[PDB]
PDB file of C-alpha atoms and ligand atoms in Angstrom:
ATOM      1  CA  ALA A  27       0.000   0.000   0.000  1.00 61.24           C
ATOM      2  CA  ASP A  28       1.003   3.611  -0.161  1.00 61.52           C
ATOM      3  CA  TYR A  29       1.312   3.543   3.638  1.00 60.43           C
ATOM      4  CA  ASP A  30       2.237   0.092   5.026  1.00 61.03           C
ATOM      5  CA  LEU A  31       1.719   0.885   8.725  1.00 62.51           C
ATOM      6  CA  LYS A  32       2.267  -1.244  11.830  1.00 58.68           C
ATOM      7  CA  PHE A  33       0.400  -1.386  15.194  1.00 55.87           C
ATOM      8  CA  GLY A  34       2.219  -3.141  18.042  1.00 56.06           C
ATOM      9  CA  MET A  35       0.585  -4.401  21.261  1.00 56.22           C
ATOM     10  CA  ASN A  36       1.265  -6.586  24.285  1.00 59.99           C
ATOM     11  CA  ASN A  37      -2.129  -8.239  24.261  1.00 59.00           C
ATOM     12  CA  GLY A  38      -2.815 -11.316  22.166  1.00 60.03           C
ATOM     13  CA  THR A  39      -5.135 -12.296  19.396  1.00 59.25           C
ATOM     14  CA  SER A  40      -7.980 -13.350  21.761  1.00 58.39           C
ATOM     15  CA  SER A  41      -8.160  -9.975  23.499  1.00 56.15           C
ATOM     16  CA  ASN A  42     -10.538  -7.030  23.413  1.00 58.61           C
ATOM     17  CA  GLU A  43      -7.664  -4.678  22.509  1.00 60.03           C
ATOM     18  CA  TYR A  44      -6.825  -6.809  19.473  1.00 61.04           C
ATOM     19  CA  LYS A  45     -10.472  -6.924  18.365  1.00 59.99           C
ATOM     20  CA  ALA A  46     -10.685  -3.105  18.596  1.00 61.89           C
ATOM     21  CA  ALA A  47      -7.378  -2.705  16.731  1.00 61.37           C
ATOM     22  CA  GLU A  48      -8.797  -4.959  13.977  1.00 61.15           C
ATOM     23  CA  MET A  49     -11.849  -2.654  13.743  1.00 62.82           C
ATOM     24  CA  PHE A  50      -9.507   0.369  13.505  1.00 63.14           C
ATOM     25  CA  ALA A  51      -7.372  -1.259  10.804  1.00 61.88           C
ATOM     26  CA  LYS A  52     -10.431  -2.222   8.739  1.00 63.07           C
ATOM     27  CA  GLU A  53     -12.005   1.243   8.912  1.00 60.91           C
ATOM     28  CA  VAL A  54      -8.713   2.965   8.001  1.00 61.30           C
ATOM     29  CA  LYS A  55      -8.191   0.672   5.012  1.00 64.82           C
ATOM     30  CA  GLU A  56     -11.736   1.220   3.762  1.00 66.04           C
ATOM     31  CA  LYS A  57     -12.025   4.984   4.337  1.00 65.87           C
ATOM     32  CA  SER A  58      -8.549   5.650   2.958  1.00 65.38           C
ATOM     33  CA  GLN A  59      -9.605   3.884  -0.261  1.00 67.01           C
ATOM     34  CA  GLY A  60      -6.802   1.403   0.329  1.00 69.00           C
ATOM     35  CA  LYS A  61      -4.028   3.958   0.664  1.00 70.32           C
ATOM     36  CA  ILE A  62      -3.337   2.898   4.251  1.00 68.27           C
ATOM     37  CA  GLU A  63      -2.978  -0.704   5.475  1.00 66.71           C
ATOM     38  CA  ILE A  64      -2.363  -1.318   9.185  1.00 70.10           C
ATOM     39  CA  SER A  65      -0.741  -4.654  10.119  1.00 67.36           C
ATOM     40  CA  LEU A  66      -0.990  -5.874  13.724  1.00 66.38           C
ATOM     41  CA  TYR A  67       1.954  -7.136  15.860  1.00 62.74           C
ATOM     42  CA  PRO A  68       0.467  -8.620  19.037  1.00 64.85           C
ATOM     43  CA  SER A  69       1.899 -10.589  21.957  1.00 61.05           C
ATOM     44  CA  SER A  70       4.896  -8.272  22.530  1.00 62.38           C
ATOM     45  CA  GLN A  71       6.531  -9.413  19.264  1.00 64.11           C
ATOM     46  CA  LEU A  72       8.180  -5.989  19.009  1.00 63.07           C
ATOM     47  CA  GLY A  73       9.000  -5.647  22.731  1.00 63.88           C
ATOM     48  CA  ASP A  74       6.869  -4.434  25.619  1.00 62.85           C
ATOM     49  CA  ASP A  75       4.996  -1.149  25.810  1.00 64.40           C
ATOM     50  CA  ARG A  76       8.108   0.763  26.957  1.00 64.14           C
ATOM     51  CA  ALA A  77       9.968  -0.525  23.888  1.00 63.70           C
ATOM     52  CA  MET A  78       7.047   0.178  21.565  1.00 63.44           C
ATOM     53  CA  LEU A  79       6.753   3.776  22.864  1.00 63.18           C
ATOM     54  CA  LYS A  80      10.470   4.261  21.984  1.00 65.39           C
ATOM     55  CA  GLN A  81       9.736   2.912  18.531  1.00 65.35           C
ATOM     56  CA  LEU A  82       6.889   5.414  18.005  1.00 67.11           C
ATOM     57  CA  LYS A  83       9.264   8.187  19.120  1.00 67.06           C
ATOM     58  CA  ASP A  84      11.885   7.210  16.608  1.00 66.39           C
ATOM     59  CA  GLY A  85       9.355   6.508  13.880  1.00 65.51           C
ATOM     60  CA  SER A  86      10.008   2.783  13.414  1.00 65.00           C
ATOM     61  CA  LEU A  87       6.517   1.755  14.669  1.00 63.83           C
ATOM     62  CA  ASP A  88       3.396   3.666  13.641  1.00 62.45           C
ATOM     63  CA  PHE A  89       0.802   2.858  16.320  1.00 59.98           C
ATOM     64  CA  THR A  90       0.705   1.358  19.796  1.00 65.06           C
ATOM     65  CA  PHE A  91      -1.291   1.342  23.030  1.00 64.09           C
ATOM     66  CA  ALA A  92      -0.290   2.889  26.346  1.00 64.01           C
ATOM     67  CA  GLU A  93      -2.051   3.749  29.586  1.00 60.67           C
ATOM     68  CA  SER A  94      -2.051   7.349  30.801  1.00 61.48           C
ATOM     69  CA  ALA A  95      -0.238   6.025  33.900  1.00 63.92           C
ATOM     70  CA  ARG A  96       2.659   4.677  31.802  1.00 59.33           C
ATOM     71  CA  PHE A  97       3.803   8.283  31.266  1.00 57.52           C
ATOM     72  CA  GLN A  98       4.995   8.209  34.908  1.00 60.71           C
ATOM     73  CA  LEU A  99       8.223   7.015  33.316  1.00 60.07           C
ATOM     74  CA  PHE A 100       8.782  10.527  32.044  1.00 62.44           C
ATOM     75  CA  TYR A 101       6.646  12.760  34.287  1.00 59.30           C
ATOM     76  CA  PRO A 102       6.581  11.248  37.822  1.00 56.82           C
ATOM     77  CA  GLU A 103       3.358  13.003  38.757  1.00 57.71           C
ATOM     78  CA  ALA A 104       1.540  10.989  36.058  1.00 56.60           C
ATOM     79  CA  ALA A 105       1.690   8.020  38.503  1.00 55.14           C
ATOM     80  CA  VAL A 106      -1.519   9.598  39.856  1.00 56.69           C
ATOM     81  CA  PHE A 107      -3.445   7.619  37.180  1.00 55.66           C
ATOM     82  CA  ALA A 108      -2.430   4.320  38.823  1.00 54.17           C
ATOM     83  CA  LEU A 109      -2.095   5.133  42.527  1.00 55.94           C
ATOM     84  CA  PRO A 110      -4.316   2.315  43.839  1.00 52.36           C
ATOM     85  CA  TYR A 111      -7.875   3.452  44.603  1.00 48.67           C
ATOM     86  CA  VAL A 112      -7.342   7.096  43.644  1.00 50.76           C
ATOM     87  CA  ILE A 113      -9.108   7.101  40.294  1.00 50.25           C
ATOM     88  CA  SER A 114     -12.607   5.859  41.125  1.00 48.33           C
ATOM     89  CA  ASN A 115     -13.937   4.856  37.732  1.00 48.60           C
ATOM     90  CA  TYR A 116     -13.578   5.381  33.985  1.00 48.51           C
ATOM     91  CA  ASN A 117     -15.647   8.563  34.119  1.00 51.13           C
ATOM     92  CA  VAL A 118     -12.939  10.045  36.347  1.00 50.21           C
ATOM     93  CA  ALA A 119     -10.114   8.666  34.114  1.00 51.02           C
ATOM     94  CA  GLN A 120     -11.617  10.445  31.073  1.00 49.09           C
ATOM     95  CA  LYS A 121     -11.985  13.767  32.863  1.00 48.22           C
ATOM     96  CA  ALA A 122      -8.570  13.494  34.515  1.00 50.61           C
ATOM     97  CA  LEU A 123      -6.902  13.216  31.053  1.00 49.97           C
ATOM     98  CA  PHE A 124      -8.917  15.596  28.970  1.00 47.57           C
ATOM     99  CA  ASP A 125     -10.534  18.073  31.413  1.00 45.86           C
ATOM    100  CA  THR A 126      -7.831  18.976  33.924  1.00 39.86           C
ATOM    101  CA  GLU A 127      -4.924  21.357  33.462  1.00 38.32           C
ATOM    102  CA  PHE A 128      -2.675  18.473  34.491  1.00 33.90           C
ATOM    103  CA  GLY A 129      -4.021  16.145  31.804  1.00 31.87           C
ATOM    104  CA  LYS A 130      -4.100  18.703  29.034  1.00 32.00           C
ATOM    105  CA  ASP A 131      -0.479  19.560  29.740  1.00 32.05           C
ATOM    106  CA  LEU A 132       0.451  15.881  29.726  1.00 30.19           C
ATOM    107  CA  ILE A 133      -1.049  15.441  26.234  1.00 30.44           C
ATOM    108  CA  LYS A 134       0.929  18.439  24.968  1.00 30.21           C
ATOM    109  CA  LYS A 135       4.167  17.027  26.459  1.00 31.64           C
ATOM    110  CA  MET A 136       3.560  13.613  24.886  1.00 30.77           C
ATOM    111  CA  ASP A 137       3.484  15.391  21.493  1.00 34.43           C
ATOM    112  CA  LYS A 138       6.602  17.658  22.238  1.00 31.70           C
ATOM    113  CA  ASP A 139       8.905  15.468  24.238  1.00 34.65           C
ATOM    114  CA  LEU A 140       7.905  11.891  23.348  1.00 34.03           C
ATOM    115  CA  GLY A 141       6.971  12.136  19.646  1.00 34.15           C
ATOM    116  CA  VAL A 142       3.429  10.809  19.962  1.00 36.33           C
ATOM    117  CA  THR A 143      -0.042  12.020  19.100  1.00 35.75           C
ATOM    118  CA  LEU A 144      -2.991  10.933  21.221  1.00 33.27           C
ATOM    119  CA  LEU A 145      -5.770   9.816  18.946  1.00 34.88           C
ATOM    120  CA  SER A 146      -8.328   8.434  21.446  1.00 32.63           C
ATOM    121  CA  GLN A 147      -8.820   6.957  24.922  1.00 30.91           C
ATOM    122  CA  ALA A 148     -10.697   3.761  25.836  1.00 33.30           C
ATOM    123  CA  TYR A 149     -11.444   1.860  29.030  1.00 33.67           C
ATOM    124  CA  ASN A 150      -9.248  -1.235  29.562  1.00 36.14           C
ATOM    125  CA  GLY A 151     -10.841  -2.666  32.706  1.00 36.16           C
ATOM    126  CA  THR A 152     -10.334  -2.559  36.458  1.00 35.70           C
ATOM    127  CA  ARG A 153      -7.529  -4.761  37.785  1.00 33.74           C
ATOM    128  CA  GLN A 154      -8.356  -7.716  40.093  1.00 33.58           C
ATOM    129  CA  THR A 155      -6.091 -10.305  41.787  1.00 33.26           C
ATOM    130  CA  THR A 156      -5.844 -13.988  40.850  1.00 30.72           C
ATOM    131  CA  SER A 157      -3.969 -16.560  42.916  1.00 26.28           C
ATOM    132  CA  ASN A 158      -3.276 -20.237  43.707  1.00 26.28           C
ATOM    133  CA  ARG A 159      -4.811 -19.930  47.159  1.00 29.14           C
ATOM    134  CA  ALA A 160      -7.843 -17.979  48.395  1.00 27.15           C
ATOM    135  CA  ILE A 161      -7.701 -14.265  49.197  1.00 26.63           C
ATOM    136  CA  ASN A 162     -10.458 -13.875  51.786  1.00 29.10           C
ATOM    137  CA  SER A 163      -8.942 -10.816  53.416  1.00 27.33           C
ATOM    138  CA  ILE A 164      -5.900  -8.611  53.258  1.00 22.22           C
ATOM    139  CA  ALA A 165      -4.152 -11.083  55.619  1.00 20.55           C
ATOM    140  CA  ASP A 166      -3.954 -13.595  52.760  1.00 19.73           C
ATOM    141  CA  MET A 167      -1.733 -11.173  50.812  1.00 19.29           C
ATOM    142  CA  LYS A 168       1.008 -11.459  53.336  1.00 24.21           C
ATOM    143  CA  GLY A 169       3.927 -13.020  51.643  1.00 27.27           C
ATOM    144  CA  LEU A 170       1.946 -13.998  48.475  1.00 31.24           C
ATOM    145  CA  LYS A 171       4.414 -14.110  45.562  1.00 34.86           C
ATOM    146  CA  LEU A 172       2.540 -11.619  43.415  1.00 33.72           C
ATOM    147  CA  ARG A 173       3.665 -11.055  39.833  1.00 31.14           C
ATOM    148  CA  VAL A 174       3.464  -7.417  38.723  1.00 30.59           C
ATOM    149  CA  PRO A 175       4.308  -5.690  35.449  1.00 29.40           C
ATOM    150  CA  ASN A 176       7.467  -3.593  35.293  1.00 32.54           C
ATOM    151  CA  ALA A 177       5.653  -0.498  36.591  1.00 32.82           C
ATOM    152  CA  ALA A 178       6.249   1.354  39.839  1.00 32.70           C
ATOM    153  CA  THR A 179       2.579   1.735  40.741  1.00 33.66           C
ATOM    154  CA  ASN A 180       1.851  -1.996  40.464  1.00 34.04           C
ATOM    155  CA  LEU A 181       4.999  -2.800  42.431  1.00 33.13           C
ATOM    156  CA  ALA A 182       3.729  -0.413  45.146  1.00 36.69           C
ATOM    157  CA  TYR A 183       0.267  -2.044  45.185  1.00 33.77           C
ATOM    158  CA  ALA A 184       1.943  -5.365  45.947  1.00 32.77           C
ATOM    159  CA  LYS A 185       4.331  -3.931  48.538  1.00 34.81           C
ATOM    160  CA  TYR A 186       1.799  -1.894  50.517  1.00 33.14           C
ATOM    161  CA  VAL A 187      -0.783  -4.715  50.783  1.00 31.03           C
ATOM    162  CA  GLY A 188       1.934  -6.914  52.197  1.00 35.64           C
ATOM    163  CA  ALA A 189       2.667  -9.156  49.201  1.00 39.43           C
ATOM    164  CA  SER A 190       6.093 -10.117  47.809  1.00 39.16           C
ATOM    165  CA  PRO A 191       6.277  -8.645  44.339  1.00 38.87           C
ATOM    166  CA  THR A 192       7.977 -10.259  41.341  1.00 39.36           C
ATOM    167  CA  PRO A 193       8.131  -7.972  38.287  1.00 38.00           C
ATOM    168  CA  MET A 194       8.078  -9.645  34.911  1.00 41.44           C
ATOM    169  CA  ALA A 195       6.880  -9.012  31.380  1.00 42.65           C
ATOM    170  CA  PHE A 196       3.340  -9.944  30.426  1.00 41.95           C
ATOM    171  CA  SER A 197       4.490 -12.615  28.027  1.00 46.07           C
ATOM    172  CA  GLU A 198       6.156 -14.573  30.877  1.00 42.49           C
ATOM    173  CA  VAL A 199       3.185 -14.651  33.265  1.00 42.61           C
ATOM    174  CA  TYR A 200       1.302 -17.763  32.142  1.00 40.50           C
ATOM    175  CA  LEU A 201       4.431 -19.975  32.659  1.00 41.68           C
ATOM    176  CA  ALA A 202       5.178 -18.375  36.000  1.00 44.14           C
ATOM    177  CA  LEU A 203       1.646 -19.101  37.242  1.00 46.02           C
ATOM    178  CA  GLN A 204       1.539 -22.619  35.764  1.00 46.82           C
ATOM    179  CA  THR A 205       4.806 -23.616  37.467  1.00 45.08           C
ATOM    180  CA  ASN A 206       3.882 -21.777  40.712  1.00 43.90           C
ATOM    181  CA  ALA A 207       7.072 -19.780  40.424  1.00 42.37           C
ATOM    182  CA  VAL A 208       4.692 -17.042  41.597  1.00 42.40           C
ATOM    183  CA  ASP A 209       1.430 -17.430  43.483  1.00 45.20           C
ATOM    184  CA  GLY A 210      -0.697 -14.866  41.605  1.00 41.77           C
ATOM    185  CA  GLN A 211      -1.005 -11.868  39.325  1.00 40.84           C
ATOM    186  CA  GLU A 212      -3.226  -8.841  38.911  1.00 39.81           C
ATOM    187  CA  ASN A 213      -4.954  -7.687  35.731  1.00 39.82           C
ATOM    188  CA  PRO A 214      -8.500  -6.875  34.572  1.00 38.98           C
ATOM    189  CA  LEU A 215     -10.915  -9.761  34.111  1.00 36.80           C
ATOM    190  CA  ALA A 216     -10.734  -9.486  30.350  1.00 35.32           C
ATOM    191  CA  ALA A 217      -6.970 -10.147  30.387  1.00 34.68           C
ATOM    192  CA  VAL A 218      -7.449 -13.120  32.749  1.00 33.02           C
ATOM    193  CA  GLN A 219      -9.762 -14.463  30.065  1.00 33.31           C
ATOM    194  CA  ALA A 220      -7.624 -13.512  27.026  1.00 31.85           C
ATOM    195  CA  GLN A 221      -4.450 -14.970  28.420  1.00 31.34           C
ATOM    196  CA  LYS A 222      -6.270 -17.989  29.901  1.00 32.96           C
ATOM    197  CA  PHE A 223      -4.852 -17.296  33.346  1.00 33.76           C
ATOM    198  CA  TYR A 224      -8.011 -19.041  34.648  1.00 38.47           C
ATOM    199  CA  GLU A 225      -6.402 -22.336  33.473  1.00 39.03           C
ATOM    200  CA  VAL A 226      -3.560 -21.865  35.963  1.00 36.55           C
ATOM    201  CA  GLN A 227      -5.259 -19.912  38.790  1.00 38.97           C
ATOM    202  CA  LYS A 228      -7.906 -21.441  41.039  1.00 37.93           C
ATOM    203  CA  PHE A 229      -8.892 -18.183  42.761  1.00 37.39           C
ATOM    204  CA  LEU A 230      -9.920 -14.622  41.841  1.00 33.83           C
ATOM    205  CA  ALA A 231     -10.335 -11.785  44.367  1.00 33.61           C
ATOM    206  CA  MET A 232     -12.199  -8.544  43.650  1.00 31.83           C
ATOM    207  CA  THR A 233      -9.530  -6.173  44.784  1.00 31.51           C
ATOM    208  CA  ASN A 234     -10.640  -3.395  42.383  1.00 31.37           C
ATOM    209  CA  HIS A 235      -7.291  -1.741  42.874  1.00 29.86           C
ATOM    210  CA  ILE A 236      -6.195   0.057  39.638  1.00 26.95           C
ATOM    211  CA  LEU A 237      -8.338   1.423  36.819  1.00 24.45           C
ATOM    212  CA  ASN A 238      -6.735   1.025  33.371  1.00 23.68           C
ATOM    213  CA  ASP A 239      -7.412   3.231  30.379  1.00 21.54           C
ATOM    214  CA  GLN A 240      -5.949   2.615  26.924  1.00 19.42           C
ATOM    215  CA  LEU A 241      -4.585   5.322  24.602  1.00 21.38           C
ATOM    216  CA  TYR A 242      -4.492   4.894  20.830  1.00 20.67           C
ATOM    217  CA  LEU A 243      -1.143   6.532  19.963  1.00 23.32           C
ATOM    218  CA  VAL A 244       0.465   7.353  16.614  1.00 24.50           C
ATOM    219  CA  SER A 245       4.072   8.248  15.899  1.00 25.94           C
ATOM    220  CA  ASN A 246       4.389  11.907  14.975  1.00 24.85           C
ATOM    221  CA  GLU A 247       6.823  10.901  12.242  1.00 26.06           C
ATOM    222  CA  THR A 248       4.008   8.893  10.578  1.00 24.12           C
ATOM    223  CA  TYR A 249       1.093  11.181  11.395  1.00 26.27           C
ATOM    224  CA  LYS A 250       2.876  14.246   9.895  1.00 26.90           C
ATOM    225  CA  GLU A 251       3.363  12.496   6.584  1.00 27.27           C
ATOM    226  CA  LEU A 252      -0.302  11.733   6.058  1.00 24.94           C
ATOM    227  CA  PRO A 253      -2.241  14.367   4.096  1.00 26.23           C
ATOM    228  CA  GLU A 254      -4.830  16.046   6.302  1.00 25.09           C
ATOM    229  CA  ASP A 255      -7.757  14.068   4.856  1.00 26.61           C
ATOM    230  CA  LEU A 256      -5.977  10.833   5.800  1.00 29.60           C
ATOM    231  CA  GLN A 257      -5.068  12.231   9.224  1.00 27.87           C
ATOM    232  CA  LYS A 258      -8.821  12.723   9.667  1.00 28.27           C
ATOM    233  CA  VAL A 259      -9.564   9.157   8.550  1.00 27.57           C
ATOM    234  CA  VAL A 260      -7.103   7.874  11.155  1.00 28.41           C
ATOM    235  CA  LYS A 261      -8.353  10.118  13.949  1.00 27.81           C
ATOM    236  CA  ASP A 262     -12.013   9.353  13.288  1.00 26.78           C
ATOM    237  CA  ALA A 263     -11.271   5.597  13.091  1.00 24.63           C
ATOM    238  CA  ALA A 264      -9.387   5.728  16.398  1.00 29.42           C
ATOM    239  CA  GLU A 265     -12.312   7.494  18.070  1.00 30.26           C
ATOM    240  CA  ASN A 266     -14.790   4.936  16.720  1.00 29.79           C
ATOM    241  CA  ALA A 267     -12.553   2.045  17.764  1.00 27.83           C
ATOM    242  CA  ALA A 268     -12.112   3.454  21.256  1.00 29.05           C
ATOM    243  CA  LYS A 269     -15.868   3.572  21.846  1.00 24.44           C
ATOM    244  CA  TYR A 270     -16.128  -0.074  20.733  1.00 27.32           C
ATOM    245  CA  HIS A 271     -13.110  -0.995  22.874  1.00 25.37           C
ATOM    246  CA  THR A 272     -14.725   0.562  25.954  1.00 24.60           C
ATOM    247  CA  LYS A 273     -17.979  -1.309  25.271  1.00 25.00           C
ATOM    248  CA  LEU A 274     -16.188  -4.664  25.044  1.00 26.15           C
ATOM    249  CA  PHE A 275     -14.731  -4.114  28.495  1.00 24.99           C
ATOM    250  CA  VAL A 276     -17.920  -2.762  30.088  1.00 26.64           C
ATOM    251  CA  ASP A 277     -19.848  -5.839  28.863  1.00 29.21           C
ATOM    252  CA  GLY A 278     -17.138  -8.279  30.000  1.00 30.95           C
ATOM    253  CA  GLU A 279     -17.164  -6.963  33.493  1.00 31.50           C
ATOM    254  CA  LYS A 280     -20.820  -7.875  33.701  1.00 33.12           C
ATOM    255  CA  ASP A 281     -20.502 -11.435  32.926  1.00 32.45           C
ATOM    256  CA  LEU A 282     -16.937 -12.584  33.224  1.00 32.25           C
ATOM    257  CA  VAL A 283     -17.222 -13.538  36.945  1.00 31.97           C
ATOM    258  CA  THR A 284     -19.793 -16.222  35.977  1.00 31.69           C
ATOM    259  CA  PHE A 285     -17.609 -17.321  32.978  1.00 29.04           C
ATOM    260  CA  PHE A 286     -14.744 -17.936  35.440  1.00 27.45           C
ATOM    261  CA  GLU A 287     -17.022 -19.790  37.836  1.00 31.97           C
ATOM    262  CA  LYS A 288     -18.028 -22.111  34.954  1.00 35.53           C
ATOM    263  CA  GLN A 289     -14.282 -22.749  34.424  1.00 35.25           C
ATOM    264  CA  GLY A 290     -13.862 -23.772  38.054  1.00 38.08           C
ATOM    265  CA  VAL A 291     -12.439 -20.582  39.519  1.00 41.04           C
ATOM    266  CA  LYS A 292     -13.471 -19.585  43.060  1.00 42.28           C
ATOM    267  CA  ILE A 293     -14.317 -15.880  43.425  1.00 44.18           C
ATOM    268  CA  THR A 294     -13.744 -13.957  46.652  1.00 44.53           C
ATOM    269  CA  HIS A 295     -14.833 -10.548  47.861  1.00 48.01           C
ATOM    270  CA  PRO A 296     -12.329  -9.456  50.509  1.00 48.59           C
ATOM    271  CA  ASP A 297     -13.166  -6.406  52.582  1.00 48.81           C
ATOM    272  CA  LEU A 298     -11.462  -3.487  50.766  1.00 48.96           C
ATOM    273  CA  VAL A 299     -11.371  -1.124  53.732  1.00 47.93           C
ATOM    274  CA  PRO A 300      -7.907  -2.404  54.872  1.00 45.60           C
ATOM    275  CA  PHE A 301      -6.670  -2.527  51.237  1.00 41.55           C
ATOM    276  CA  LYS A 302      -7.456   1.129  50.891  1.00 39.39           C
ATOM    277  CA  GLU A 303      -6.077   2.001  54.335  1.00 40.07           C
ATOM    278  CA  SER A 304      -2.793   0.245  53.407  1.00 40.61           C
ATOM    279  CA  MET A 305      -2.255   2.760  50.560  1.00 40.44           C
ATOM    280  CA  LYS A 306      -2.268   5.875  52.747  1.00 40.48           C
ATOM    281  CA  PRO A 307       1.526   5.763  53.360  1.00 39.67           C
ATOM    282  CA  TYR A 308       2.046   5.200  49.636  1.00 43.81           C
ATOM    283  CA  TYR A 309       0.117   8.359  48.791  1.00 43.40           C
ATOM    284  CA  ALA A 310       2.311  10.220  51.275  1.00 42.28           C
ATOM    285  CA  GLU A 311       5.458   8.858  49.590  1.00 43.19           C
ATOM    286  CA  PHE A 312       4.111   9.897  46.155  1.00 45.52           C
ATOM    287  CA  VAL A 313       3.573  13.440  47.423  1.00 43.82           C
ATOM    288  CA  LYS A 314       7.053  13.532  49.021  1.00 42.94           C
ATOM    289  CA  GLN A 315       8.713  12.328  45.789  1.00 42.21           C
ATOM    290  CA  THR A 316       6.720  14.306  43.203  1.00 41.28           C
ATOM    291  CA  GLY A 317       6.309  17.560  45.104  1.00 39.30           C
ATOM    292  CA  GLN A 318       3.883  20.346  44.222  1.00 39.22           C
ATOM    293  CA  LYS A 319       3.232  18.885  40.769  1.00 37.55           C
ATOM    294  CA  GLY A 320       2.040  15.623  42.337  1.00 37.76           C
ATOM    295  CA  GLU A 321       0.021  17.410  45.042  1.00 39.89           C
ATOM    296  CA  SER A 322      -1.630  19.466  42.295  1.00 41.02           C
ATOM    297  CA  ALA A 323      -2.362  16.486  40.042  1.00 40.85           C
ATOM    298  CA  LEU A 324      -3.950  14.701  43.102  1.00 40.53           C
ATOM    299  CA  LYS A 325      -6.028  17.644  43.999  1.00 39.82           C
ATOM    300  CA  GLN A 326      -7.248  18.122  40.431  1.00 38.24           C
ATOM    301  CA  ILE A 327      -8.230  14.449  40.179  1.00 38.18           C
ATOM    302  CA  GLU A 328      -9.806  14.197  43.607  1.00 33.51           C
ATOM    303  CA  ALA A 329     -12.069  17.176  42.639  1.00 35.59           C
ATOM    304  CA  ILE A 330     -13.714  15.194  39.792  1.00 37.30           C
ATOM    305  CA  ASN A 331     -17.172  13.860  40.681  1.00 37.66           C
ATOM    306  CA  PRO A 332     -17.425  10.196  39.581  1.00 37.64           C
ATOM    307  CA  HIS A 333     -21.116  10.242  38.645  1.00 35.44           C
ATOM    308  CA  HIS A 334     -21.978  10.831  35.010  1.00 33.38           C
ATOM    309  CA  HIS A 335     -23.816  14.070  34.466  1.00 31.10           C
TER     310      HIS A 335
HETATM  311  C1  SLB B 423      -0.956  -0.773  27.033  1.00 30.83           C
HETATM  312  C2  SLB B 423      -0.256  -1.990  27.615  1.00 30.83           C
HETATM  313  O1  SLB B 423       0.748  -2.485  27.069  1.00 30.83           O
HETATM  314  N1  SLB B 423      -0.796  -2.533  28.687  1.00 30.83           N
HETATM  315  C3  SLB B 423      -0.248  -3.696  29.409  1.00 30.83           C
HETATM  316  C4  SLB B 423      -0.131  -3.340  30.874  1.00 30.83           C
HETATM  317  C5  SLB B 423       0.806  -2.177  31.174  1.00 30.83           C
HETATM  318  O2  SLB B 423       2.105  -2.435  30.628  1.00 30.83           O
HETATM  319  C6  SLB B 423       0.943  -1.928  32.669  1.00 30.83           C
HETATM  320  O3  SLB B 423      -0.338  -1.834  33.321  1.00 30.83           O
HETATM  321  C7  SLB B 423       1.780  -0.709  32.985  1.00 30.83           C
HETATM  322  O4  SLB B 423       1.290   0.505  32.432  1.00 30.83           O
HETATM  323  O5  SLB B 423       0.409  -4.455  31.616  1.00 30.83           O
HETATM  324  C8  SLB B 423      -0.357  -5.638  31.497  1.00 30.83           C
HETATM  325  O6  SLB B 423      -1.594  -5.401  32.127  1.00 30.83           O
HETATM  326  C9  SLB B 423       0.489  -6.662  32.299  1.00 30.83           C
HETATM  327  O7  SLB B 423       1.683  -6.796  31.974  1.00 30.83           O
HETATM  328  O8  SLB B 423      -0.081  -7.242  33.244  1.00 30.83           O
HETATM  329  C10 SLB B 423      -0.554  -6.064  30.064  1.00 30.83           C
HETATM  330  C11 SLB B 423      -1.166  -4.892  29.272  1.00 30.83           C
HETATM  331  O9  SLB B 423      -1.324  -5.329  27.895  1.00 30.83           O
END
């Protein structure tokens, strides 16, 4: 094609993210009259999300996904998006990004410093905790060998609840669970399904601890080369795909608990009051480390009412 573009992702071919990326690719190909073809590179073929963000910056990959929170790697205050229990729901996540001074500035910096254009934002589920033994209360976390991604906020979730974290890439998790090298992991329900973690985890606990969004990002080096009518095709397709993406996750959350039960998984509902209490010293450490910018980001986010209006 005139533009042989590539979209890298960590998720696999059975995931909601992949299905939404397929919708995006199809719409772009059709509405560009075949000028643009987007090929998909799932399952961390190209590296993890940190690697893929570098590749968008240098123009060697055209599209990828990232969470708003992942930008903590560059702007420490952006950890606010994944401080456990701070962002209440997706309504808050949307407003935090697009309707705060903090979030608007972040989007501008992503364009200036990191070489990426934000096309759209979707919901990517609320993270829960799976394990090889029951989590009936916070006490069961103590010393649980909890896999986390290579992200400071997830590492802190594990530490402050009393678990023993083991960071590793997403691709490595199924093996680690299967062999009981670790005792559990934490991810939204849809990823537990997509990766078939239910095959290698007998328990799931509704810890509700981190809210994930999902940004459709394009390399500036690619986006600048597209004539403006094709930029519009891409932007509009990303917005349409993100609405579909969100819907896939909202519907999965409704029924996935009963899917897992049918697969033999035992679901627990630990009391979250001590989980939330356990994060208070972590918030204090975030404020100490990130200073006025972090205090401000917190304040701006805590001011957002979570009810749709
Ligand atoms: C956009 C993206 O790549 N998301 C990935 C996230 C983030 O890397 C992580 O939450 C840090 O931001 O980690 C996973 O949930 C995980 O490894 O468990 C896989 C998911 O596909």
